[model samples]
Target: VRHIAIPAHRGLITDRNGEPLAVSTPVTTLWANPKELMTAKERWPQLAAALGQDTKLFADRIEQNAEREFIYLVRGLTPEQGEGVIALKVPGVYSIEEFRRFYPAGEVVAHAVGFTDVDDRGREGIELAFDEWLAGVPGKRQVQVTKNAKPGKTLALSIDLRLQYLAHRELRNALLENGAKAGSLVIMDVKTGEILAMTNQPTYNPNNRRNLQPAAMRNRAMIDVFEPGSTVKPFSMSAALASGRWKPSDIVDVYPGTLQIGRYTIRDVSRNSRQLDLTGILIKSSNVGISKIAFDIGAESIYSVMQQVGLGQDTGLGFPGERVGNLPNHRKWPKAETATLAYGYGLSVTAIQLAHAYAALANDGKSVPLSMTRVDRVPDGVQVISPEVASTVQGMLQQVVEAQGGVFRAQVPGYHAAGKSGTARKVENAYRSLFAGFAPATDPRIAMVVVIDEPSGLVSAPVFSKVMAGALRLMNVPPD
Candidate 1:
């Protein structure tokens, strides 16, 4: 009358093209009825040998726990081994059918796809996010064994496997080439807020846990936070346009380069002082010029767009350990901090959050909640700013990559790219290099953010160009 229990298969997690990201492979779980096993103690050595256990220790443990009816002898064994163990067929020993969560993508998409535990439960990443949905019911049957089990449903994520690998390779190479500490990258659909590809460096494979480190398994793109630096310029530029005081052609006097706002001084490293139009300001990446614009526009206008664009807010995907980056806490919009905020200081953001905000710029100022799973419909989003204003800011961002560009390295080979780079300061000497932008500037489709921690130079900008070019090519978007 002993009914054997069998675990149903965990759902298959696939990419947009049906390539497996996370899948289930058959394994055997060996459990035993101690009382029954003792009835055939003579076969203990055979059972222990098959399981790679010390016969003496195995017998001792079983004897000590003899009162317990059921015990797990070995979990997650190869089917072949399980078959051999069952062939031993010691009276009380048995093997049940189960599946092991296998990550085919490995560390390439490890941070996003996550890993499962020995018991086949989700421990991190997407695995944790959709655990219950992917974990099917366990059924028991003796007379009709395995008859009552239901297999888990399939899950299709929004990631494009092709681009995911390309992004991963690019980030890995950038870190190695630049001798940087670590990095993260994300490519999101501007139209639907679908995260097409997201990868982080210092990653670990879910399938290989023999020598794992917690830090390596971190989902940096979604969880790690940094001050964002100058990547927020376009949004601040959006703030300027939203004020109705600044125009695309307006000129800000950035003569002699530096500006002192109350106590702190704002300086430009890309170029020295000059009289630059709003487009030129972005082209030169002049902190002085942007500060003047923000100061004239006041902190409220700056705050308005930052608030609307979802800065300092959690990107809706809600991946485990994802952070809501900080915004300024000052009650009064003080001078220096306001100027600092104009060029991406005084606030912080994760790689995905920064990319999500850039998607707003790419999406004509309409902000959508981000999604990890595939979206069949074109997601409707909030209008973070007026369409006209969004267009104006995008063009200014384009000029930053165009003829008089500050980050020409960020430009795709055949496509007109639009973006800005940021070298934000850390504790005392460390700085994070970042670039945020969109490709096919005339008709934006994808927004991406590349971040390199403790970099040698502005390496993230160059990585942006390489990764963006490859992503566009993979997605088969025509270059304009």
Candidate 2:
């Protein structure tokens, strides 16, 4: 009876805005001292009725512990419920106060905020990563009513709950509406490197985490890596524009849809083959054209840009099991790698990494470290590319969403818009669909990405583009 060291208090979790995400609520648990009670046969009926158990079960438990040792009778009863039972004042029955972590948002921020174990220890996500900060140190508190009873500190993340919910809603519906297997989206404030929203479809609640598949529990935005397909074009284009190898107006003769390049023919989904300038290369998302530009700029320069942009490198965010997308050094790259890499075939990156790269361009070619913790002020970022190069690439990106026959349905009433749509063959390590874009193309504020994993349902080019356009519209960023 004297050996059970119960928890006196627990931590409270809050969002960035100091809104309560999770908190500890007091509860009562009942236990039995079997020896203090009458004969098991006599007490079984009353105990079983009160505990909501079979008389046989209660009698067996009581008989097993003949020494009157404390044994659990009931758990998770509210204070009122406990008091109601105590009014009966049954012999050998006692109740103690305990704390339970309650998530108000429930299944909404399940994967991000995560959940604690029965022992109140952080088990996953931010909870596990910043546990020392959130849970506080045991037995080392300066102020305490009792040595073991102490409340933990609050953790404020940089996540914007509003934007997170928005992204989640959009991504979730997009997946369901399109009948896709899975999807992911990330929205970042390009200027401060703050993650406004990062969401994945097919997410599961962490509270009831049993019998879950690894795929369902995955955080696709950061943890899963895949071939980015044509979304990788902007990075390659940035390299070409940065190296002085090409100009926005520089023209490359592109023969219609496909180009024969040593055992592989790079093809554009749209069979319109016209001579396109550097900006046109991106607007059309011509695989052969982008591949040619990749050849002209050479692998060394592009790989350098990739490295500077944090491709193939860990982001160092405080999360469990994040992946660094695959990228090969230029010197070690195979001949076919150059062509394939241009259109996002050989390289791989998580959606967060890709969004971070685009944010660098959006912020005039400088990229800063992203953080989940709130900062008093953001620091300056390293220059990943020149502003001129960024503008050139952005102009090309603008045409993709604005130009006629563009992949995304960019024209949204009055606001000018720009974006790129990518559809790749996933038969041999390719992404079936990927799209990265931002709104208010004239003056950008939000940069977003939508990636679908192996989508076979929404293949109609116009229909999917309209769905994407509607998504932007939902955020009040009208299409061009």
Candidate 3:
């Protein structure tokens, strides 16, 4: 009796609606028993041609492995090529049933859905993250020949292919139009904390890996960190409100548009008002106003609120190579550090982290664990702020969209929207623009973040508005 190992059919990776993102296609793998192949030497050239191999090289390989019972001539053959090999039927050569991983969505879902290796092993993205679950145990049997293999469990992910496609298309276009180095976008469900779509620019086609580069394969939304600029002002406001040190109508002097702290000075892009109320601070994105408030609220209060919003922590998706951005200890904050932190300068966060934090605001101060896999019920969340404080902050954020000179580019027609625009300077003095917010501010449904790195001309707000408009419509979210 001969022993044969049967390959376990890798599982199907589907979108939440059961549409296939990744699946295994049955293929023929041509192999040979070198000892048997020596019996049909004259057929060598034909066999090599059928398998698309150099005859001399192929024969040399077979000769070297002659002591072995089996050697692969070629794997993952198309039906026609497989048929050709079968027709040759050289004594020692044989074709076996195998599986080849196929990506249906291709580059659109490349970074998130990931791709598998030649042996059907998970190599990146969700494929690597859930390899064990996607890769079933192979079985061995004693027989003259092996037959069809058993398939693995079907994995249902939280991705919405429709939204995913939209995000991919929009982000790719934005990157090209803006001449940006790279960018990322994430769309999350406010109620369930489900990632509806996560996409990145400069993506590669998983179906074709001939010139794949590690840089193009990164899931940037969850891995890359950057200063969030004024986007964190809302969180600082949250801390101020929670500390009872500030009210929505409280006044802060932003005159001269600059605040001096020892040797460092924080300045707004332009002077909007001599004095701004708490609402105006966010609407105008006043760095000076926020610095004053953050000092009064103290570093601990601000840090507490940031920590509560999941900063400096893993998202728990356990995505391969996922990063927890830097949220430094504010306990020892210098005056300059405190001031910059208030306006999102001293701290850094991944795009997903920023979206997750904003989702807490959209979810009525509750922060839920993000999920990549499907959930039967919306899991309970940890309260990051009181419902009352959350409501006030939500109202203030709405002003960021409705107020003139705010993130008007993020406004969605026929719906009340809210969000913040951030343009942070990189270490190299380049700009990384970002927009993070939720829509239908009255009854929130979607939270999203868009980040463009090293942008030449585009800012984040316009990209956010265009993508969110399409997302809201695709989601069928009713206008307020």
Candidate 4:
């Protein structure tokens, strides 16, 4: 008697409600014993036709492994394909039961719920991130001519399928409409810090991986970073508010819409009032106004607040290939660097990192750890700032959606929405447009971040509005 290990079924990866995102399906693999196959040479042509391989090439491969006891002719064959080979009744050729991964969500959830390899091993995305949890130990048994299999435990993820679909569809539409190179969006629960939905454009179908490039496989939301532009303004303002030095209505001069600092100059998109209060600064997204505030508060304070909010660090979701964005050390920062950093130029952040920071604001100054898997109770969080400071900042952000020239497109009907819009130029004449915010501003529930890379027309706010509107409705959070 010979012994063969039965490949364990990799655990099923499901959404929050137990809906399958990645699962395994039964399949058959055709293998041959070279020594036995030598006597069945006349039947080789029929086997080659069943496998859809050239006869000469098939014969050559078998010849190369002629001395081996067994070699895989083909793996992951369809039922009909496997049965057809068995019907050939070739003495040396045999079929063994196996499992192949199936992604029911396809490209819609590709970046977040990654695919596996031919041997049923995790490769990318969450598949690689939680490989051990999702991949259980395979079972073993002694066998003869037949074979058997084992199943792994089910893994429940925090991802909500409905919201994931919404994010994917909206982001995909925005990319195509704006002729953008790529885009990503992330949504999280403010209280729990659970990632509800995350998606990226230029995605590939995990089912058919032909011509799959490394670029297409990347989870941009977690792996790539970009200057967040005005999205960073809220944190700057948060720092200023937390300092106990600046009040919400305090005035700062922004006359002429520009500020000369050493050799570099900070300018706004449009000339406005000679002076703006803290609220006005955020509403107008004034670069000069914010730079002045940062210079007064000092870079160390800004960096401290940013670090507390989880910037310049990994989001702790432990996603594969995640990037910890650059945040310049305040000790080495020049005056110009400090000024530019206030307006989101001197630092970079990934989409998930940006979302995590915003969730702290939405959760009343408490910052919770981000989770990709579902949690039983509300996770504990540390206070990054006073609740009063976060509330004041939330109030200021509300005006951004309500005030004229602000991101009015981000407003949701019957709900108080708060957010910031950002537009920044990249190294190669490209633009990274961004929006980060939370919904029902008065009592926040969900925090979101949307980024459009190298877009020709569209900005990020509209995409945020579209995705969040659906998310709120799906979550059944009543209108405030």
- What local lDDT score does residue 430 receive in model 1, on the 0 to 100 scale? 65
| Candidate 3: residue 435 Cα off by (Å) | 0.5
Clashing pairs in 2: 256-273, 410-480, 411-480, 412-479, 412-480
Q: Per-residue lDDT for 243-298 in model 1, tens only?
A: 87988888888878888766677878755656788888877778889888888888
Q: Tell me the lDDT of candidate 3.
A: 0.86
Please write out the lDDT profile of model 2 over residues 1-480, one tens digit for every residue.
123454645566666677777787888888877777654356568667866788887787788788756677888888896887777677888787877778776666766777778667777677777777666544423334235544577767666676677667766766666678877777776777777666777787775678767777777787777777777788888888877668888888788678787787777866676788877777767778887888877877777787888877888887888888788765566557888877777777888888788778777788888876665588888998888887767777778766765654544345555566776443245555677766556666566777777665133233324433444554565445
Quote the positional error of residue 25 for candidate 2 in Å: 2.2
Backbone clashes in model 2: 5
Candidate 2: deviation at residue 8, Å? 6.0
> How well does candidate 3 match the true structure in TM-score terms?
0.95
- How many clashes show up per model? 1, 5, 0, 0
* Winner of 1 and 2 under TM-score: 1
Q: Summarize candidate 4's per-residue lDDT along 1-480 as a digit string, tens digits.
A: 667777877899999999999988889998889999998899888888878999999889888898999998999887776898898899898788888889998998898888888778888888888888777777556634354444667878889999999999999888888889888899999999899999988899999999998778889888777787888888899889877789998999889998888777888976767878888898888888998889888888888888899987877777777889888785576779888788888888888988999999999999999998897788678999789999999999988887776788888776889999888555255678888989989999999998888787137888888898899999999998
Instruction: Give per-model TM-scores.
Output: 0.94, 0.86, 0.95, 0.95
Tally clashing residue pairs in candidate 1: 1
**Clash pairs for candidate 4:** none
**lDDT (C-alpha, whole model) for all candidates:** 0.84, 0.71, 0.86, 0.86
Candidate 1 minimal-lDDT segment of 10 residues: 422-431
